[PDB]
Amino acid sequence: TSIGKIWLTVLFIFRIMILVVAAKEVWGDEQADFVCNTLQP
Amino acid sequence: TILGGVNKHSTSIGKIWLTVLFIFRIMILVVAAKEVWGDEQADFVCNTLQP
């Protein structure tokens, strides 16, 4: 169908597109700049 | 001089109160306990990063 291929595959490419070229660098520093107000090792 | 004036002008048991006030209260406070509380806040350690 029209929604079966065109819309489903485009939305799938969109989700991949966001994950690689945009989202991956947002999470690159998740633990490096996780900051806790403590002195406990 | 101050100790002598108080001691002579005192009763019998009042001399026992005087000696327990001096050799026990004043002495241990001055020569022993004063340096125990010297670093009370300097060596107060808190597990935190909060200024």
Give a quick precis of the structure.
It is classed as membrane protein. With 41 residues, chain A is mainly alpha-helical. Chain A contains 1 helix and no strands.
Q: Can you summarize the main beta sheet of chain A?
A: none
- End-to-end Cα distance of chain A, whole Å, is 58 Å
Annotation, overall tally of beta strands of chain A: 0
What sort of overall outline of chain A do the alpha carbons produce when their principal axes are compared? rod-shaped
Largest interface: A-B, 4 and 4 residues
Assign a percent range to the helix content of chain A.
55-70%
State which percent range the strand residues of chain A make up: under 5%
Provide the structure class of chain A. Answer: mainly alpha
The oligomeric state of the chains shown is part of a larger assembly
Number of helices of chain A: 1
Family (chain A): Belongs to the connexin family. Beta-type (group I) subfamily.
Protein name (chain A): Gap junction beta-2 protein
Transmembrane segments (chain A): 4-23
Subunit structure (chain A): A hemichannel or connexon is composed of a hexamer of connexins. A functional gap junction is formed by the apposition of two hemichannels. Interacts with CNST. Forms heteromeric channels with GJB4.
